[PDB]
Amino acid sequence: NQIAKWLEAHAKPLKTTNPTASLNDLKPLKNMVGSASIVGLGEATHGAHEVFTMKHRIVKYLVSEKGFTNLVLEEGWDRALELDRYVLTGKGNPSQHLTPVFKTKEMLDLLDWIRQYNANPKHKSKVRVIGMDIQSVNENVYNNIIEYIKANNSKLLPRVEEKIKGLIPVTKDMNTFESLTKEEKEKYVLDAKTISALLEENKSYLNGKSKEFAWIKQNARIIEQFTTMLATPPDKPADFYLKHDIAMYENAKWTEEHLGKTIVWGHNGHVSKTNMLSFIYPKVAGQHLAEYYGKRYVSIGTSVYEGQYNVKNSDGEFGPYGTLKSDDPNSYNYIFGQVKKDQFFIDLRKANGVTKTWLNEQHPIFAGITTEGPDIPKTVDISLGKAFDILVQIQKVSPSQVH
């Protein structure tokens, strides 16, 4: 209540929320993002048009001005293998590999711009696309391990290809695995390990210290990750969610360490330095990254006020069923909805005073949960100043374009 003036005072305004625009309004970001090695970029909800494009704008600014070259998104590591191929070679059909929810025009736009920047021969440093989610493990990941152990050691093939053969049909999706028994709790878990271990023994015979072998070991790890979270946790879902996000954490951090400066695109919940999804996740990736990189990890979160958006309804259908209702004046959403600006971002770290403690207290915010039902919170408590370094506020939003 008191001073929403400070928020107006330190609010670096955003002229527009359209991908193909000035991009100049984002200059304040240089010294703000500073010299961070990895940058979290979250979205309040997974189905708003303006949130997608505004994040798109920042990837644009961060790739061209701060030299970031990787874009780790909340998509399956495997699916992204076909996404990488596109931004680079232009071959393929992206919408086929994106998760139903992200099959929006905004995602295809974002991927198209990366391919364009990747086309100009002047840009000697290409932007890669990596997925950090592991909700399946398709054959693209397995052939990546096979083809390698044929170019560098066609002799181990009969040993590793035995286990991947028996692995493919049980990792095609989380249901085909969660519905096993000792198969899951044994053979498959340990087999993924025997494959990751095998490549280790013959490291010194597979161009170990090399850049392409590093990449192959990682694909193997994906099979461990998947195999790990599913089937191990029985009556303990908290472990599934926990191992799940330790995995996302692992794959982004892998990206940073081997591919360079990295952008981490995903839900606000997964990139905040604080666990705002406590009701299901014991700890989220953002915390792991922050604990590990320290301040080399900067998290920019997005927040909304008024609008409509896509979300699954109590029945299971995805569509423009969402409707923002920032009634609670104690929520960060109303207080930010007073700032008379269409779009604007503010560095929450440079706050001192009542504003500094208010930001560090705990207030409700739009949780942007994927599914809306009678027993699903639509808001959660969070210490904003402790969750994000930067915050991007967009007043009104509309449903993403899924057609």
Residues in binding site for Ca(2+): 46, 74
Q: What is the largest CA-CA distance in the chain?
A: 72
Phi/psi at 59 (5° precision): -70, -40
Q: DSSP H helical segments within 125-236, as ranges?
A: 139-151, 157-167, 174-178, 189-201, 211-229
Contacting residues for 76 by C-beta, under 8 A, at least 6 apart = 99, 131, 133, 134, 135, 136, 138
Task: Note the residue count of the chain.
Answer: 403
Please list, residue by residue across 154-191, b when 16 or more beta carbons sit within 10 angstroms of its beta carbon and e when fewer do: eebeeebbebbeebbebbeebeebeeeeeebeebbbeb
* 92, 86 contact by CB (below 8 A): yes
Query: C-alpha 375: how far from its chain's center?
Result: 26
| Gap between the Cα atoms of 347 and 29, Å rounded | 9
Residue whose entry in the numeric block shows the structure tokens 């560090």: 360
| Gap between the Cα atoms of 381 and 394, Å rounded | 20
307 Rama class: left (phi>0) / alpha (psi -120 to 50) / beta: left
Q: Which amino acid is residue 294, in one-letter code?
A: G
* DSSP assignment letter at 184: I
Q: Can you say which residues are annotated as belonging to the binding site?
A: 46, 74
Cα angle 141, 143, 148 (rounded to 5 degrees) comes to 110
* 131, 73 contact by CB (below 8 A): yes
CA Rg, the chain, in Å? 22
